[PDB]
Structure formats: structure tokens, C-alpha cells
Design a protein around this ligand. Structure first.
Ligand SMILES: Nc1nc2c(ncn2[C@@H]2O[C@H](COP(=O)(O)OP(=O)(O)O)[C@@H](O)[C@H]2O)c(=O)[nH]1
Ligand SMILES: O=P(O)(O)O[C@@H]1[C@H](O)[C@H](O)[C@@H](OP(=O)(O)O)[C@H](OP(=O)(O)O)[C@H]1O
Ligand code: ALF
Ligand SMILES: [Ca+2]
Ligand SMILES: [Mg+2]
Lengths: 749, 318
């Protein structure tokens, strides 16, 4: 029961907070609200000007102890130990883990902050909200305009010009045709600015010759109307994923298609006759039913009962570092930001504390980097570990504390700060013996697992004992799943090209952690796919650097309800099976696929007239991995570019479960607009909007692409005729028996 | 240590036994089902019961059947609003609702015409024995696990360590869309094992409401045996569901659906053999002996007798 985002009445009518500030010390009494749909946290502050926070950009909400406390005593004089801190709320939001702003509020009322904080989080981490339909993102823009009003409550035109700043002369002529005001100096009554009128403004603003083309294509030569059955046949034939069963995933019945007309078609003359128009069709294309993905994919609908080594695990390398390796800040916040974002393996380079306090602290190998005390980092993990995922968090230590007094202290710090979660002895079902598998994620829900070297910190270790890797032969000789080994990028690459299959077999039982080479001094990332191809679970990356590599990582781990664990393919888990990760031809037992991504158009992609191009790359096994496709750069148009392009083919995806399609838009020059990672095994077929996302996988609002995908099961060239007969044997055999019966008289005898 | 491994294919149209047969392998040859493994099926049995009842409830509208007893309209509305996907318990009011519905002559007359819509072939098995299932401490029997229905998709392999040889049997989906995927299990195939529901002779496919299920199975078998991958492969043909034939053949006549039938009505043995004949006889593009067997995949002893023979035929030819 994955429910859609609901805004409780407390947040609709609102509550009175005083928005205070660490820096400028600005005390402002405000009324926090949330709009009905749960898009924006907003509040009126200075004189009468409305501020909005985009909930999709919220990374965390903190209350009580975890709320940031006012250091300045001048502010704290205006405010006022326990019950004082009970009514604090800190909202954290930002486009990436590093660049985050804090918005501290304090409620006047008692135990009020805890309702807001918890509900803001529920909305901020809601899945349907992040994977909203195209129409919903359009309705989110409508809301923003209707929210941010001048001091006298009206919607100023100059914000409608800011939102659609590409071709302002077009936005003016768009607004005049609706009957709205079109001068930059004047404003519009919220009264007069209906959603239906905003919906018409969008239409007249951006012509859809692509959607006109698609309507002709389907059938309607008399184009302004469309029958119910036509829509049904289009939906069943073109918009249906053909890899799916007709019983488990039935086709559309006409009664179901009727409900789609009623849901979308505005015209009551069409609706009464069970017909649809361009308007209703265009509404459906970007509808709640016609997503690029099915919910299952996004939902936590993966088996979690398999052993821990059978999953790709979201992992961080030197989590504490915020920018560089050699010189840069060491932040405790990054642990918060990592775990909140679904990371399940965070690293801690603990070091020997100085002689004044003798407190263990964390920093990079005696480099030009700042420090943070260990005690604090553990408290930050305790807070955020299972805030976004109930599944285990492995603590990748790198202990440089050879003092016994601090070793027993940091073990206590682990015991006292985590408590019940911290796994200290092995479970009853899975002893630390030979021939025993690792426990499942299910079995270790809400458990912190330390990964530290051995021979007080060692006795905490149990299921993740690191060992110095000798060979895949030596590992097989022992047959101990509780043991594991880390591998620096280049050494992992060595085992990859030389012993790829023995690596997979190793990873079927035991764990391999992988981190970037030491020479990546500017926190550069390596392609994690390279080692997911050999089953490596803990492919550690630098979360501070959002290049293509991290974009992928963040993108793929979204799926399975942001659990952090993704189930490996069947043949990379089962002991009895085997295959070559470098195979250039289809494997028997594994249903290969073929993909046909075609970029049609895109809307509101940039805020200034510029050419735009779109890349279509795939990431999987090396045979699947093809990343050179690119559309021609549009002719200085950003509102509604329409690429008359050849389809991008991916004729043979050998292992589609491992394969991941990446669709990204760029400005002419190369500036990043937005991207999307789509799991190939789940992607739908036909025309769908691909609502773009930023580099940290946050949903952007207006930039969206239209694409046409075809994703069916693979059929070789020679075996095309044979396949057709399996799918429809009556036809073939019927002809053969007819031919023979036509030869009846002629044979005789 | 050094055992040879042979690879068999379970092919057939949808809902013919493939998966059931695999369970029988798991029972007889495989690890079997512990009481732990049986509790996994409890949800599935509950869902079956709903699905089956919801199918009959829609069929009362479709086929225009009145509910004999008035109060069942209320029960009918209760059960039809349930989303079967979210079912994980069989408590009241649903237990009494469905029991009350199953008791209604109108619902019974709808069952008598299950040919005219898509209803499972373990529906009566479950819906008669509701008291044992409604029980709050209920653990499904081995036969309850065999009778349960879970549509298959893709390509699943199940190895079985029999004393002399290991059988990598590959269960597949039978529906039309699924048959496109079959090619990715066609390499190095010792034997094809084709299953056919003897009971489906008067039924039309799910994926096609105007085409006969046996006509499709027949046609599919004739095609599949004459493929390059199966030159050096034996072809065991399981004609399954013999029990349902014996049951059905009393009222539904094979003459009415296959007009080139010459034997008498209400004779099960004559009809099963005609169907065997239909599949293997007069095949110009086939020259391989076909080892047919009349199976009932929900009868552990029948399958234990049957497969142990098929083993001795396969190993002989290899
Ligand atoms: N009465 C009866 N039912 C059977 C027999 N074989 C299979 N079934 C049932 O028919 C349904 C379909 O079986 P299944 O193995 O799922 O078919 P598949 O899709 O070909 O794997 C299940 O509910 C089985 O219990 C049989 O010999 N007799
Ligand atoms: O972060 P950097 O600067 O690349 O430093 C390495 C990295 O932290 C590894 O994770 C760590 O191994 P662990 O996986 O054991 O922490 C290794 O120590 P080691 O070689 O002594 O194991 C370090 O050299
Ligand atoms: F209908 Al099937 F396996 F062929 F469930
Ligand atoms: Ca480190
Ligand atoms: Mg099946």
C-alpha cells in the first residue's frame, strides 16, 4: 500500500513559527503552510512577500536535539533547556549533498514542531511525488505562480515571464489570446487565473505539431476526433510493454478506456459520444497511467530474503570529505546526507587523538584537510541511518587508532550511541561457520554492521570481517561467507580483465568492496558499472562529486523503494549457473532484449533561447554498454524543440536486468539541463514523457522530454520466422494442412 | 562428483501443468516442501479463492444469471470490491460471504458454464473445502500446494539430482507473448517434454476468446518438434488432466468441437486416444518416435510412475 502524498489539515491551515537565522539574525514571525497537493512549503515573511521552498528539494527535516541550535546569544535572548528545544524545526534542502541551506524555524506552540518535521519528511521522501505524471509537474508550476504573489495578493505578470523567459514576446501573445493581462508592469487576480485558463495558456504558448503527427499516425485522418476503440487499440498495441503476460498484465477493456476519456477529455460533446480530442489525448500522454515506468519498479517490490552478497549495495568512499582529497573540509553533515540519500555503506577514517582530550577524530591521511570528532559522526549516523530505509548500514572503518584506551572508548561510543541496532553477536540462524551463507537484508533490518580489522573494536565484527585477498582459489578453499575483501580501483580492474568469471563466482558467496584509486585527488569517480558487471556489491564512490558516475549510482539505487539494496541478476547469484561477463552473444537461459529509443521533442528545457541536444546512452555488460548516440542540436529553440531524428537502436541487450538506459539533455555548448536513469528491464513502450531530473536525481519541474520506446524480447535474424510460429502456430499449421489438402485430388492412389 | 547433466524443456500452452509437474519433481526427486515452505502458499490459496469467486461474480453479469437468494447480492458486492493483490487473510465477513455465494444455485449454475469464461481448474477443489481453509491455524496440505495457481513468466531452470543423472528442467510461460522468449532455452536440449491439457478441448484461449485451446496446443506441438534445435532430441508428450476429461466428457461432447471425431459420446478413453492421434498422426515433416503418456500432474503417484519411465527412455537414447 504505497499511498500518495497527503497534506494533513495542520499544514493546510498552517501554524505560526518564527523564522530565525544564524547569519543575519533576522527574527520574522511567519505562518508556515503547505499547498493542498504538497508541492511547496511556504510562508510570508518580510513586510508581505511570499517565500516558497520546493519540497522535492528537501533533503531532511530535523526537530528536538537534531534541530540546529542558535549559537548567537542575542537571538537566544529573544527566544529563551528541554521544552525550549522541543519546539525547534530545521529544514535542510539543496540540489546536492554538499550545497545545502538550513532554514531554522521555531513554533510558538507546544509539541508542534514534531508534527511539521515528521509530515514535511513524509512529503519530501514520497515516491509518487518524485515520480509524478507530466501533468502533475505542470500543475506544480501553476501552484508556484498562484503562491508567489505580491503584497496585495495578486499574481504579477513578470513571474509568468520569469518562468517562461525563453521567448517573452510569445508569452505576451499567449496571455493576450487567453484574455489575461500581458504587460510586465501589472498583475493578475488569483480569482481570474484558473487552472483551466493556465492550461489554455500552455496550449497557445507551445504548439504540439509532434502530437498532431502522432494522432495522424495512429489512424484519425479526420484528426479532431478519436473513437474509444482507437484509443484502446493504440494503448494495447503501441503503449503496452510486450515482454509482459496477457494474464498477469491484462490488456485494456473498453470500460477501462471509457474511464480514461472521463478522466481527461474536456469537451463534453466528445465525452458524451465516448471520444477524445487532441486536448484530452495530450492530457493522457502526460497522465498518471501513461508513465515511462510501472510502479513495481520504484516500489520496494524486490525479494529481500536472499543472502547479503546477492545484492548491489549503495556505498560511499571517504564519506566525510566534502570536495577534495588532499585539501578540503571534513563534515559530519555528509554522513547525514549520504545515509538520507540511501547509502548503506559509509566510510570512517578514524585517527589517533591528541594528548589533551584523547578523543578519536576523523580526517584524511594527514593531509591538508580539517577534522571532525568521532563521537559526533556516530550520533549523526544514529539519527539518519534508517530514516529513509529500514535495511542494514555497513560501517566501513579504516582504523588508525592503536591505543587501547581509545579503542575501548570508540567501541563504547558504538555500543552506547546505537544500542539495540548494533549487531554484536552472530544471529541464531547464521553462525560464523564454514558453508554458511550471509544473512538476508530482511534478517538484518535496522542493524548497524561494523567492518573493522581483527588481531574491543574487533569483537563487534562478525558478518563483515575484512581480509587480505590472496586469490579466488584461496577464497574457495576456505568457503567462509562472513569474510570479505576491499579492492582499490586498479587492482579490481586487474581481476576484472583476467579472472572475470571467478570474480562473479567469488561474489556469489562473499563480499567485495571497491574504492577509487588514490590518484583521483579531486574526488574523481570511476564507472561503477565496471564492477557491478562482476557482481561487486560495495562499489564505493565519492558522493560529493556528481559526475556521470554518481548520477548513475544515485539513479539506479532509487529503484526498490530507495532501499539501497538492488537484487543481482539470477545468473550472478545461482551457484549452479555460469556465464562470461565479456560475452558478445546471448546467453542461454537469459532472455535478451532489444531497445529502440527515439527522441521526439521536449518542453521548457532551458530559461534562455539556445540550441539543445539529447544523448541516449546505455550502461550494462560491455556488450550492452553503448554510449555514443546524440540528436542534432536544435535551432536555438528551448520552449518546444522537435527533433526529426532517426531512432537510436540497441539491437541486442544481452543482460537487460543489469542494463540501464540514460537519457540526458544539454544546451548548445554542453551545459547540463537534466538527465534520467531508466532500468531497461522495466522501461515501457510507446510514447511517454521523461520528466527530467538534476544531477542528484531531484525531480525538475518544467524540463521534460517526449520519447518513443520499443522494448521487446530479442529475436535473432535467421530465427525470426521460427518465432512468429511459436507466437501464432495455428496460422502456420493451418496453411500447411491446407496446402496438403489442396494436393488431395492430385496425389490420388 | 562426475555426473552427466541433461537438459529437458517443459513446453505447452498456458495452464497445462508445466509448473505443477515441476512441483511433483520437487516432491519426488527434489527437496520437497517442509511445513515452513507450505506457509508460503497460504496467501496464494486465499488469493485463488477470491480470484475464482470474482471471476464467477462478473460471469453472473456477463452470462446474465440471477442470484437465487436475495442477500447474496450484498455478499457479491463485498467480494467484488476486494483487490486480490492485497489479500493476506481469510477472515470474516469474507469467509461467510464466499461460502454463502458458493452455496447459491445461481453461482452454482454459473460454475456449470465455466467453459464460457476464464475460471481456474482448482476452483471446486478449494471452494468446496472452505471450512478447512477458513480455520485460523490453517496449514495447506501437499495437495493444496499442488492445486494452487501462479502464472509463470520467462525462463526458470530447476536442476534435480537424481542418482544416475541430473535433469536441468526449464519451466516456461505458455501464453502467446511468452513463446517469443522460448528461443533463449533452445540450446543443447536432450528432450522436449510437451504438456497438453486434455480438458481444454472445448475451451478458448485467454489471450484469444475465439480460438480453441487444444487446436492451439496441437498446432504448437506440430510446429515445435520440427525445429533445427530438436533434431537429436527425444519428444515426450504428456497428455495431462485425464481426470478432468473423465469428468467433463459426460456432458460436453468432443464431436461438437472436433467434428472429425468418430468414437462414441461420454467415453473418456476413446477421446483421449483421438487427441493423442491428432497430435502425432499424419506428420510429413516429422520422423521421430513420440513417447506419449496420459498424466494427471496433481497425482503424485501417477507422476512418480510416469516420470521414472520417461527417465529410462531418455538415458537409453543417450
Ligand atoms: N484437476 C487437475 N488440475 C490440474 C492438473 N494439472 C494441473 N492442474 C491445475 O491447473 C492449473 C494450471 O497448472 P500450472 O502448472 O500452473 O500450468 P502452467 O501454466 O502450464 O504451468 C493449476 O491450478 C494446477 O493445479 C490435473 O492433472 N488435474
Ligand atoms: O581513502 P584512501 O585515501 O584511498 O585510503 C584507502 C581507503 O580508505 C581504503 O578504504 C582503505 O582500506 P579499508 O577498505 O580497509 O578501509 C585503505 O587502507 P588499507 O590499505 O590499510 O586497507 C586506504 O589506504
Ligand atoms: F499458464 Al503457465 F506456466 F503456461 F502459468
Ligand atoms: Ca578512507
Ligand atoms: Mg506455469
Amino acid at each position: 500500500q504505497l499511498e500518495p502524498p497527503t497534506v494533513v489539515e495542520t499544514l493546510r491551515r498552517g501554524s505560526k513559527f518564527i523564522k530565525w537565522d544564524e547569519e543575519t539574525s533576522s527574527r520574522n514571525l511567519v505562518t508556515l503552510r503547505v499547498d493542498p497537493n504538497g508541492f511547496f512549503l511556504y510562508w510570508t515573511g518580510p513586510n508581505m512577500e511570499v517565500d516558497t521552498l520546493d519540497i522535492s528539494s528537501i533533503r531532511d527535516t530535523r526537530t528536538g536535539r537534531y534541530a540546529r541550535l542558535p549559537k548567537d546569544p542575542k537571538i537566544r535572548e529573544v527566544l529563551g533547556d528541554a521544552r525550549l528545544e522541543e519546539k525547534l524545526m530545521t529544514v535542510v534542502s539543496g540540489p546536492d549533498p554538499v550545497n545545502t541551506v538550513f532554514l531554522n524555524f521555531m513554533a510558538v506552540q507546544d509539541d508542534t514542531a514534531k508534527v511539521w518535521s515528521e509530515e514535511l519528511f513524509k512529503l519530501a521522501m514520497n515516491i509518487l511525488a518524485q515520480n509524478a505524471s507530466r501533468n502533475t509537474f505542470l500543475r506544480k508550476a501553476y501552484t508556484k505562480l498562484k503562491l508567489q504573489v505580491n503584497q496585495d495578493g495578486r499574481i504579477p505578470v513578470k513571474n509568468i515571464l520569469k518562468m517562461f523567459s525563453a521567448d517573452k514576446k510569445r508569452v505576451e501573445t499567449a496571455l493576450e489570446s487567453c484574455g489575461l493581462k500581458f504587460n510586465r508592469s501589472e498583475s493578475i487576480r488569483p480569482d481570474e487565473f484558473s487552472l483551466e485558463i493556465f492550461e489554455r495558456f500552455l496550449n497557445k504558448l507551445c504548439l504540439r505539431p509532434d502530437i498532431d503527427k502522432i494522432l495522424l499516425e495512429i489512424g484519425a485522418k479526420g484528426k479532431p476526433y478519436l473513437t474509444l476503440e482507437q484509443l484502446m487499440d493504440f494503448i494495447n498495441q503501441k503503449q503496452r510493454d510486450p515482454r509482459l503476460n496477457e494474464v498477469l498484465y491484462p490488456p485494456l477493456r473498453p470500460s477501462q478506456a471509457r474511464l480514461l476519456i472521463e478522466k481527461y477529455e474536456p469537451n463534453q460533446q466528445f465525452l458524451e459520444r465516448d471520444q477524445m480530442s487532441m486536448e484530452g489525448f495530450s492530457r493522457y500522454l502526460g497522465g498518471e497511467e501513461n508513465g515511462i515506468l510501472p510502479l513495481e519498479a520504484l516500489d520496494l517490490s524486490t525479494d529481500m530474503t536472499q543472502p547479503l552478497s546477492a545484492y548491489f549495495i549503495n556505498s560511499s568512499h571517504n564519506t566525510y570529505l566534502t570536495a577534495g582529497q588532499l585539501a578540503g573540509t571534513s563534515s559530519v553533515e555528509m554522513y547525514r546526507q549520504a545515509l538520507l540519500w540511501g547509502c548503506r555503506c559509509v566510510e570512517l577514517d578514524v585517527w589517533k587523538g591528541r594528548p589533551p582530550e584523547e578523543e578519536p577524530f576523523i580526517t584524511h591521511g594527514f593531509t591538508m584537510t580539517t577534522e571532525v570528532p568521532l563521537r559526533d559522526v556516530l550520533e549523526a549516523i544514529a539519527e539518519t541511518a534508517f530514516k529513509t530505509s529500514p535495511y542494514p548500514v555497513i560501517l566501513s572503518f579504516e582504523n588508525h587508532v592503536d591505543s587501547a584506551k581509545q579503542q575501548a572508548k570508540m567501541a563504547e561510543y558504538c555500543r552506547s550511541i546505537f544500542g539495540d541496532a548494533l549487531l554484536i553477536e552472530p544471529l541464531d540462524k547464521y553462525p560464523l561457520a564454514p558453508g554458511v551463507p550471509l544473512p538476508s537484508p530482511q534478517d538484518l533490518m535496522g542493524r548497524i554492521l561494523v567492518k573493522n580489522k581483527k588481531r574491543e573494536m574487533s569483537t563487534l565484527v562478525n558478518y563483515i570481517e575484512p581480509v587480505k585477498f590472496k586469490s579466488f582459489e584461496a577464497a574457495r578453499k576456505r568457503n567462509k561467507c562472513f569474510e570479505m575483501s576491499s579492492f582499490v580501483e586498479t587492482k579490481a580492474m586487474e581481476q576484472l580483465t583476467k579472472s572475470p568469471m571467478e570474480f562473479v563466482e567469488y561474489n556469489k558467496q562473499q563480499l567485495s568492496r571497491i574504492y577509487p584509486k588514490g590518484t583521483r585527488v579531486d574526488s574523481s569517480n570511476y564507472m561503477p558499472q565496471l564492477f557491478w558487471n562482476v557482481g561487486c556489491q560495495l562499489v564505493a564512490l565519492n558522493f560529493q562529486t556528481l559526475d556521470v558516475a554518481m548520477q548513475l549510482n544515485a539513479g539506479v539505487f532509487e529503484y526498490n523503494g530507495r532501499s539501497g539494496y538492488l537484487l543481482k541478476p539470477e545468473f550472478m547469484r545461482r551457484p549452479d549457473k555460469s556465464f562470461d561477463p565479456f560475452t558478445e552473444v546471448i546467453v542461454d537461459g537469459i532472455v535478451a532484449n532489444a531497445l529502440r529509443v527515439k527522441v521526439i521533442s521536449g518542453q521548457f528545457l532551458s530559461d534562455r533561447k539556445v540550441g539543445i541536444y539529447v544523448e541516449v546512452d546505455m550502461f550494462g555488460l560491455p556488450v550492452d554498454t553503448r554510449r555514443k548516440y546524440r540528436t542534432r542540436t536544435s535551432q536555438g529553440n528551448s520552449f518546444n524543440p522537435v527533433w526529426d531524428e532517426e531512432p537510436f537502436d540497441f539491437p541486442k541487450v544481452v543482460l537487460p536486468t543489469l542494463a540501464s538506459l540514460r537519457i540526458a539533455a544539454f544546451e548548445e555548448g554542453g551545459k547540463f539541463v537534466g538527465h534520467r536513469i531508466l532500468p531497461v528491464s522495466a522501461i515501457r513502450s510507446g510514447y511517454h514523457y521523461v520528466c527530467l531530473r538534476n544531477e542528484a536525481n531531484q525531480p525538475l519541474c518544467l524540463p521534460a522530454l517526449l520519447i518513443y520506446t520499443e522494448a521487446s524480447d530479442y529475436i535473432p535474424d535467421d530465427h525470426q520466422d521460427y518465432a512468429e510460429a511459436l507466437i501464432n502456430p495455428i496460422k502456420h499449421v493451418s496453411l500447411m494442412d491446407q496446402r496438403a489438402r489442396q494436393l488431395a485430388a492430385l496425389i490420388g492412389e | 562428483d562426475a555426473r552427466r547433466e541433461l537438459k529437458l524443456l517443459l513446453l505447452g500452452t498456458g495452464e497445462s501443468g508445466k509448473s505443477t509437474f515441476i512441483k511433483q519433481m520437487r516432491i519426488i526427486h527434489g527437496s520437497g516442501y517442509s511445513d515452513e515452505d507450505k506457509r508460503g502458499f497460504t496467501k496464494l490459496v486465499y488469493q485463488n479463492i477470491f480470484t475464482a469467486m470474482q471471476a464467477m461474480i462478473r460471469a453472473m453479469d456477463t452470462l446474465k444469471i440471477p442470484y437465487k437468494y436475495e442477500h447474496n447480492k450484498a455478499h457479491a458486492q463485498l467480494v467484488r470490491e476486494v483487490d486480490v493483490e492485497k489479500v493476506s487473510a481469510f477472515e470474516n465477513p469474507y469467509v461467510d460471504a464466499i461460502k454463502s455465494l458458493w452455496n447459491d444455485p445461481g453461482i452454482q449454475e454459473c460454475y456449470d458454464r465455466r467453459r464460457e469464461y476464464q475460471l481456474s481448474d482448482s476452483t471446486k477443489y478449494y471452494l468446496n473445502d472452505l471450512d478447512r481453509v477458513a480455520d485460523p491455524s490453517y496449514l495447506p496440505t501437499q495437495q493444496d500446494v499442488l492445486r494452487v495457481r501462479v502464472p509463470t513468466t520467462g525462463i526458470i531452470e530447476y536442476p534435480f539430482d537424481l542418482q544416475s543423472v541430473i535433469f536441468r528442467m526449464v519451466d516456461v510461460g505458455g501464453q502467446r507473448s511468452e513463446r517469443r522468449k522460448w528461443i533463449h532455452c533452445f540450446e543443447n536440449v536432450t528432450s522436449i517434454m510437451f504438456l497438453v491439457a486434455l480438458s481444454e478441448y472445448d475451451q478458448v484461449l485467454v489471450e484469444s476468446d475465439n480460438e480453441n485451446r487444444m487446436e492451439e496446443s496441437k498446432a504448437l506441438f506440430r510446429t515445435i518438434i520440427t525445429y533445427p534445435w530438436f533434431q537429436n532430441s527425444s519428444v515426450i508428450l504428456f497428455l495431462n488432466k485425464k481426470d478432468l476429461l473423465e469428468e467433463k466428457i459426460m456432458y460436453s461432447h468432443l464431436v461438437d468441437y472436433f467434428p472429425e471425431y468418430d468414437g462414441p459420446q461420454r467415453d473418456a478413453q476413446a477421446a483421449r486416444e483421438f487427441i493423442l492421434k491428432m497430435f502425432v498422426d499424419l506428420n510429413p515433416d516429422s520422423d521421430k518416435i513420440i513417447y506419449s503418456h496420459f498424466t494427471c500432474a496433481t497425482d503424485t503417484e501417477n507422476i512418480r510412475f510416469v516420470f521414472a519411465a520417461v527417465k529410462d527412455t531418455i538415458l537409453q537414447l543417450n
